[PDB]
């Protein structure tokens, strides 16, 4: 085992980066938010649900055990 | 695979061709029904074998003479 | 439409909500202390589990010939992890299902009919197929 | 080595060798020269007419 740092709620830099990482990244899953930031992972699940209501991300597929989200579906 | 014919087949096959040479065709099914009438073979699977060898012999007997 | 046509995952999630609006279902006091079956290790997350289960009760009666408190439990039962011992099947609670079916019968969406089992009232059968088309109206079947 | 990647195809299978039958002798045609042929040892299950990917044809088989 190991020790990895995580945060269960946001602070400034995480939240502000969260809005601007979106157009920079084509793939968006909660797992990828775990590594690029230090985020719990369950935090990232609900964080993406918020963004989809704004239309800053787009759903592309959904399942019980895995969920995919994309940038804006533009090209 | 395997399934090399036993002596019980080869003994009676020769006999049945000698004394009922005329009745034979060269088809499987006709040669079966003849063996069923000119003799009784007490199994069904055994009958399907003895016919097939009787057929296979009758092919060669229409060439040069068999030595058995 | 008949209830056969539609998805059934969708069916219950609109039927559960329907009942709770209309003041229907007089619920037992015990609903926040209830494991809900012998083979569970926890209470449900849900806080309106009673409403959800009454949906699934009335649906099965539409399909099959209707049966009592015993049979409902057998339909719901699942696997029991006995720890170090190998898992086996077992049946869940009874006294919950005995409150469910009597609560439905108070609304006269079911009734004790002949041949050893409650059967769903024509008023009940009307209400099922009424909201069955509401499902198709909603999304689009 | 400094030879580029060669391609050569089976003409015939000869028989199996090794100390558990794990190697297979095979004859192969060079696929650029139709009168050239070398014998090889090939590990995997082969049929006939399939193509291999030799790194050299300096090597040649003679025994198990």
């Amino acid at each position: 085992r190991d020790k990895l740092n995580n945060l269960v709620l946001f602070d400034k830099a995480t939240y502000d980066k969260l809005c601007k990482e979106v157009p920079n990244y084509k793939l968006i899953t909660p797992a990828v938010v775990s590594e690029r930031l230090k985020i719990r992972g369950s935090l990232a699940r609900a964080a993406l649900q918020e963004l989809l209501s704004k239309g800053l991300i787009k759903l592309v597929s959904k399942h019980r055990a895995q969920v995919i989200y994309t940038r804006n579906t533009k090209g | 695979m395997g399934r090399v014919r036993t002596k019980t087949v080869k003994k009676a096959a020769r006999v049945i061709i000698e004394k009922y040479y005329t009745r034979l065709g060269n088809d499987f099914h006709t040669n079966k029904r003849v063996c069923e009438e000119i003799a009784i073979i007490p199994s069904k699977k055994l009958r399907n074998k003895i016919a097939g060898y009787v057929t296979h012999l009758m092919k060669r007997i229409q060439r040069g003479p068999v030595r058995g | 439409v008949t209830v056969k046509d539609v998805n059934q995952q969708e069916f219950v999630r609109a039927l559960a909500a329907f009942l709770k609006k209309s003041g229907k279902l007089k619920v037992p006091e015990w609903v926040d202390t209830v494991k809900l079956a012998k083979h569970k290790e926890l209470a449900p997350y849900d806080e309106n589990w009673f409403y959800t289960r009454a949906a699934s009760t009335a649906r099965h009666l539409y399909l099959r010939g209707g049966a009592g408190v015993g049979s409902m439990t057998k339909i719901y039962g699942g696997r029991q992890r006995n720890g170090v011992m190998p898992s086996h099947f077992s049946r869940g609670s009874k006294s919950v299902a005995r409150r469910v079916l009597q609560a439905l019968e108070g609304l006269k969406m079911v009734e004790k009919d002949q041949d050893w089992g409650r059967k769903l009232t024509p008023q009940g059968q009307r209400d099922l197929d009424r909201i069955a088309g509401q499902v198709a109206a909603a999304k689009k079947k | 080595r400094v030879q580029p990647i060669k391609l050569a195809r089976v003409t015939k299978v000869l028989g199996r060798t090794g100390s558990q039958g794990q190697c297979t002798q095979v004859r192969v045609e060079f696929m650029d020269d139709t009168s050239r042929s070398i014998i090889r040892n090939v590990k995997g299950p082969v049929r006939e007419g399939d193509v291999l990917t030799l790194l050299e044809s300096e090597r040649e088989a003679r025994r198990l």
């Binding site: 084509k26 793939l27 899953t29 797992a31 990828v32 775990s34 590594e35 992972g41 592309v60 597929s61 399942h63 055990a65 895995q66 995919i68 994309t70 | - | - | 990647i5 391609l7 090794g18 100390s19 794990q22 190697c23 090889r40 040892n41 090939v42 590990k43 995997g44 299950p45 082969v46 049929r47 399939d50 193509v51 291999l52 990917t53 030799l54 790194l55 090597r59 198990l64």
Partner: protein
């Protein structure tokens, strides 16, 4: 399209095998394209019979291993539908051409074996069948995603699609293209 199945959305046309060596054991589109990878359960009763069945199905078969996952072929197909989806968003290709490169780049060119002399280990270099290459390459990359997701927050779908990228474009960040070159490095030595 109306006479030949896609994959449920993914064309099997504009898909090539870019070797002449490894085709006729890689095929996916001659008529072998189907809506789903599944069989009635005929796959082997002859040595040649193995080859015929699709590459995409073979991948699904070798994905379920190690005890708890055996006999759960439907769960396995969930991982594959996400894989192609992730591969297409992530790089943007016909996501089968990714897989075909990933298989061809992971198959060994030469291999070693054992030979008994003097009661001591000696090794001999030998060649490898095209059918061996395909079987090996399917094995190797599936071990990668299985290994990575054994304590990672990442799901196996994500891990597997990453593993086909690094195989399809060699970069030695995969479990496959590493392990390929290990074998060939041995085969040079004892030869």
């Amino acid at each position: 399209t109306p006479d030949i199945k896609l994959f449920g959305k993914w064309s099997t046309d504009d898909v090539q095998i870019n070797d002449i060596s490894l085709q006729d054991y890689i095929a996916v589109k001659e008529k072998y394209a189907k809506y789903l990878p599944h069989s009635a359960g005929r796959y082997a009763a002859k040595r040649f019979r193995k080859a015929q069945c699709p590459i995409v199905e073979r991948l699904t078969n070798s994905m379920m291993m190690h005890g708890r996952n055996n006999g759960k072929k439907l769960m396995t197909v969930r991982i594959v539908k996400h894989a192609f989806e992730i591969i297409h968003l992530l790089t943007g290709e016909n996501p089968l051409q990714v897989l075909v490169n990933a298989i061809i780049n992971s198959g060994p060119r030469e291999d070693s074996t054992r030979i008994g002399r003097a009661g001591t280990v000696r090794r001999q270099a030998v060649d490898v069948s095209p059918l061996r290459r395909v079987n090996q390459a399917i094995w190797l990359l599936c071990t990668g995603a299985r290994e990575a997701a054994f304590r990672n927050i990442k799901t196996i779908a994500e891990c597997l699609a990453d593993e086909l990228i690094n195989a399809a474009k060699g970069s030695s960040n995969s479990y496959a293209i590493k392990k390929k070159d290990e074998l060939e490095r041995v085969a040079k030595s004892n030869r």
